[PDB]
Design an enzyme around this catalytic site. Structure first.
Site, mmCIF file in Angstrom:
data_model
loop_
_atom_site.group_PDB
_atom_site.id
_atom_site.type_symbol
_atom_site.label_atom_id
_atom_site.label_comp_id
_atom_site.label_asym_id
_atom_site.label_seq_id
_atom_site.Cartn_x
_atom_site.Cartn_y
_atom_site.Cartn_z
ATOM 1 N N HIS A 276 -4.900 31.655 -3.948
ATOM 2 C CA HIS A 276 -4.430 32.028 -2.617
ATOM 3 C C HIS A 276 -5.111 33.278 -2.090
ATOM 4 O O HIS A 276 -5.120 33.496 -0.874
ATOM 5 C CB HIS A 276 -2.919 32.242 -2.614
ATOM 6 C CG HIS A 276 -2.134 30.981 -2.763
ATOM 7 N ND1 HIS A 276 -0.773 30.974 -2.976
ATOM 8 C CD2 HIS A 276 -2.517 29.684 -2.727
ATOM 9 C CE1 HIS A 276 -0.351 29.727 -3.070
ATOM 10 N NE2 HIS A 276 -1.391 28.923 -2.920
ATOM 11 N N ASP B 182 1.888 15.103 -2.695
ATOM 12 C CA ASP B 182 2.176 15.432 -4.085
ATOM 13 C C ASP B 182 3.397 14.689 -4.597
ATOM 14 O O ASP B 182 3.471 14.395 -5.791
ATOM 15 C CB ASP B 182 2.377 16.938 -4.244
ATOM 16 C CG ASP B 182 1.082 17.710 -4.136
ATOM 17 O OD1 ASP B 182 0.027 17.156 -4.506
ATOM 18 O OD2 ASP B 182 1.116 18.869 -3.676
ATOM 19 N N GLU C 197 -5.483 14.532 -32.827
ATOM 20 C CA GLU C 197 -5.027 13.598 -31.813
ATOM 21 C C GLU C 197 -6.104 13.447 -30.742
ATOM 22 O O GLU C 197 -6.863 14.378 -30.461
ATOM 23 C CB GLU C 197 -3.700 14.073 -31.228
ATOM 24 C CG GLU C 197 -2.958 13.039 -30.396
ATOM 25 C CD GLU C 197 -2.455 11.859 -31.212
ATOM 26 O OE1 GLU C 197 -2.197 12.018 -32.425
ATOM 27 O OE2 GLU C 197 -2.306 10.767 -30.625
#
Ligand code: HEM
Ligand code: HEM
Lengths: 83, 378, 73, 55, 100, 89
Positions: free
Chosen positions: B200, B227, B270
């Site tokens: 920002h 969104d 993983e």
């Protein structure tokens, strides 16, 4: 030719109010209007339209102040809603 | 006049979300900041409940996760929510990073630095989280990564038995990993707030690289509802992943008690950690392997030095765009080699893939893009 | 970078906008947007996918060479 | 149908909130019953309610 | 020439003749690019912000203006390069005057 | 009501406003309405009819906005739409 056509089409018979206000008289003005308006020979328009509702913006930063108007559809003449 | 523009909290919320001058150009590729935010708060909340019903001890860990999968209502669905939410979190994170690299948004400095610190924090955090089930794969992977921390000489064995709690893997090591996984995502959310703060400060971007001050549109009520749409799509994908196939991306070899004498044939981290595991096993060197890993990530930090073009985004430069898609395909190739066992011809083509990866990112991006600059009669 | 009010000095621009209730939600979805998305697909996938057919040739070629090398019993 | 609906349930905010909560409860009713009905109808045969019917 | 044909093919494949843009609209902003943008004529700067706003609205709506409106290959009224070269020369003059 | 009465009485005086009142009366009314009938139709409306008319015309509508000048700080149209009707903030 188009402007004489405009004059022949619009400004003639059904659409005219002659008003006279003040310390005056009714009958003599009535008679002289009957004199001067003798022989007009005038004998389909005013249709509704759409209120869309939209936005337009002029970005022009060379102007000193900002002018913004917003409007909704108004009633018209023949309603107490207008009052 | 307004409570929103005057209250010293609603000023922060107003200059964050309500009246933020946002571009009128960004596609679904820019939803992923909010998608990582919602994935992160989902991970916080589901991890909070899973941590309410958990006991960290080397016998009670597997037993307690069995207790959560069997006894308590919906405990198995919140377990699967936290696991597959971590997996979808990392996929959205790499889409976020690929957006930020391909659309030239990495010309920002401090945004990129805080994002790198976020990357380190989330990777170590989710690694400790995967160590928490105390599975056989998790036991050996904890051994592998902690001795990789011991790979640096003169500090290594002392520092790693210091972060062990003995000369081997202890109950205390599991309590340490529980505490650090248990505390890290709040620091991650704070660094995400600092990330958003410098964002920002600067201002957002478009697909084109052209600065877009003429058409700043508010975030509300446009990117709020976009969104919402993207987050509902993420939630439905996450729920079909946790309901219809919970082990399509859940590796089956995790579900055994951690026998300290077991030694399975297959071993891997993983499946998000495959390219960080392949470059280690690419170059046959201990310190060279951990150094090549650190070099891979820090060259991805180095990337804003490498920008030599006159443009910003690769939307207009087709040949370096195709070179970037060669990089995308090489990322997927390293994922596939991570999905293939530790054998000799695959290590040959993995060395080919990793050195071609570094040949693209180190050398061919600035030289290729400066040929792109040179070709436009400039 | 900051909020509104200062950003860039622009003259000479008119923008026409419409209230959304006059307009339909999906104007010609299956007759104009489908040629648009087919053109946008048709432009880029012959640049993006040919790295992936290299990936698939590496897939098949390396897989079969590996099975030939490791199944010599 | 439409203008009657805007006249009844879409003038003030509290009436809109009440009618969406009442719609949520009626959707709870019909949606739970239809979902359980279709789910156990495509799993007729080796489902537990047949064995509870026998036993 | 081979490389000039590469240049024509490359400007065709770059894809902002589709978008209705020019040479002086694709530049990344450092400090000195912004300084050369401040050093611009009035009519060129207003044409530049109008072309930027057209490209923004089009790439939002993801529509390309048709074949009759594309910016051709050597009709281009390129303009930002002399200001840019003057700013580069003045910047390098100042920095080398500090180097000496 | 006090200001509308005073404004209309102060309007209907002089040669030009009264004569244009005659004109704009006989444009569409079919007659000229005097001051007494407007006085009555002012007295015929209480507050309940006022909030009925304002809910009839203003609430949750599709306006028309014309901006002119340095008007960048004006937000986008759907903000004016979603703030035009009160959801009580
Ligand atoms: C501060 C909030 C968090 C808490 C309290 C927390 C706590 C836990 C706990 C107790 C477990 C073990 C549950 C089990 O064994 O099934 C776990 C597993 C895990 N956590 Fe977290 N976690 C948090 C946030 C995160 C975040 C942000 C990530 C990264 C996206 C993450 C990644 C994981 C992973 C990958 C596992 C293993 C999943 C599995 O069991 O299959 N956690 N977490
Ligand atoms: C911890 C996970 C992360 C979170 C929660 C996060 C959060 C966000 C948010 C909320 C935004 C603004 C929304 C938007 O994209 O428009 C954003 C943008 C951005 N983030 Fe992140 N981010 C994360 C990871 C990263 C990483 C790893 C990097 C790379 C170092 C990064 C670099 C950027 C950049 C460059 C932008 C601006 C993109 C643009 O203006 O085009 N972020 N992030």
């Amino acid at each position: 030719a188009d402007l004489t056509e405009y004059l022949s089409r619009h400004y003639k018979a059904p659409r005219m109010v002659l008003a006279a206000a003040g310390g005056l008289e009714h009958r003599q003005l009535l008679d002289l209007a009957q004199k001067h308006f003798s022989g007009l020979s005038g004998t389909p328009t005013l249709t509704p339209c759409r209120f869309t509702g939209s936005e337009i913006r002029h970005r022009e930063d060379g102007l000193p102040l900002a002018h913004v108007a917003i409007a909704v559809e108004g009633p018209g003449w023949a309603n107490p809603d207008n009052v | 006049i307004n409570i929103r523009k005057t209250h010293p909290l609603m000023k922060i919320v107003n200059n964050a979300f309500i009246d933020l001058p946002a571009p009128s150009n960004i596609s679904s590729w820019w939803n992923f900041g909010s998608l990582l935010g919602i994935c992160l708060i989902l991970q916080i909340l589901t991890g909070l409940f899973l941590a309410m019903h958990y006991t960290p001890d080397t016998t009670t860990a597997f037993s307690s996760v069995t207790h959560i999968c069997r006894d308590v209502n919906y405990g198995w669905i919140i377990r699967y929510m936290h696991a597959n939410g971590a997996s979808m979190f990392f996929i959205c994170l790499f889409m976020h990073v690929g957006r930020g690299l391909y659309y030239g948004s990495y010309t920002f400095l401090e945004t990129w630095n805080i994002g790198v610190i976020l990357l380190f924090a989330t990777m170590a955090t989710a690694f400790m989280g995967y160590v928490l089930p105390w599975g056989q794969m998790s036991f050996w992977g904890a051994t592998v990564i902690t001795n990789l921390l011991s790979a640096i000489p003169y500090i290594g064995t002392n520092l790693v038995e210091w972060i062990w709690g003995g000369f081997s893997v202890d109950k205390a090591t599991l309590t340490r990993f529980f505490a650090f996984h248990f505390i890290f995502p709040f620091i991650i959310a704070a660094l995400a707030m600092v990330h958003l703060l410098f964002l920002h400060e600067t201002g957002s971007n478009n697909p084109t690289g052209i600065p877009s001050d003429t058409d700043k549109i508010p975030f509300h009520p446009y990117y709020t509802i976009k969104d919402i749409l993207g987050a509902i799509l993420l939630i439905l994908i996450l729920m079909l992943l946790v309901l219809f196939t919970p082990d399509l991306l859940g590796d089956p070899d995790n579900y055994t008690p951690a026998n300290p004498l077991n030694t399975p044939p297959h071993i891997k981290p993983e499946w998000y950690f495959l390219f960080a595991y392949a470059i280690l096993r690419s170059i046959p060197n201990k310190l060279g392997g951990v150094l090549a890993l650190v070099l891979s990530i820090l060259v991805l930090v180095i990337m804003p030095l490498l920008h030599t073009s006159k443009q910003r985004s690769m939307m207009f430069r087709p040949i370096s765009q195709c070179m970037f898609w060669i990089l995308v395909a090489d990322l997927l190739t390293l994922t596939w080699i991570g999905g293939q066992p530790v054998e000799h011809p695959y290590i040959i083509i993995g060395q080919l893939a990793s050195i071609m990866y570094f040949l693209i990112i180190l050398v061919m991006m600035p030289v290729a893009s400066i040929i792109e600059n040179n070709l436009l009669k400039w | 970078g900051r909020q509104f009010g200062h950003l860039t000095r622009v003259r000479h621009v008119i923008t026409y906008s419409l209230s959304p209730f006059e307009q339909r939600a999906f104007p010609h979805y299956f007759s104009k947007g489908i040629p648009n998305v087919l053109r946008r697909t048709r432009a880029c996938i012959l640049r993006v996918a040919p790295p992936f057919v290299v990936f698939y040739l590496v897939y098949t070629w390396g897989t079969q060479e590996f099975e030939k090398s490791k199944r010599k019993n | 149908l439409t203008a009657r609906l805007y006249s009844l349930l879409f003038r003030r905010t509290s009436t809109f909130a009440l009618t969406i909560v009442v719609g949520a409860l009626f959707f709870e009713r019909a949606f739970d019953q239809g979902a359980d009905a279709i789910y156990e109808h495509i799993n007729e045969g080796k489902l537990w309610k047949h064995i509870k019917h026998k036993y | 020439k081979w490389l000039e044909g590469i240049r024509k093919w490359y400007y065709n494949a770059a894809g902002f003749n589709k978008l209705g843009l020019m040479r002086d609209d694709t530049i990344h902003e450092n400090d000195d690019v912004k300084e050369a943008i401040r050093r611009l004529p009035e009519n060129l700067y207003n044409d530049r912000v109008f072309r930027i706003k057209r490209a923004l609205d089009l790439s939002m709506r993801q529509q390309i203006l048709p074949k009759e409106q594309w910016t051709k290959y050597e009709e281009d009224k390129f303009y930002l390069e002399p200001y840019l070269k003057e700013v580069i020369r003045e910047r390098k003059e100042r920095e080398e005057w500090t180097k000496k | 009501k006090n200001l509308l009465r005073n404004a209309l009485v102060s309007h209907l005086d002089g040669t030009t406003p009264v004569c244009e009142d005659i004109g704009r009366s006989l444009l569409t009314y079919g007659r000229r309405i005097p001051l007494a009938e407007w006085e009555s139709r002012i007295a015929e409306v209480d507050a309940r009819v006022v909030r009925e008319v304002c809910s009839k015309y203003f609430y949750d509508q599709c306006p028309a906005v014309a901006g002119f000048g340095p008007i960048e700080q004006l937000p986008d149209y759907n903000r004016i739409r979603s703030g035009m009707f009160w959801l009580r903030f």
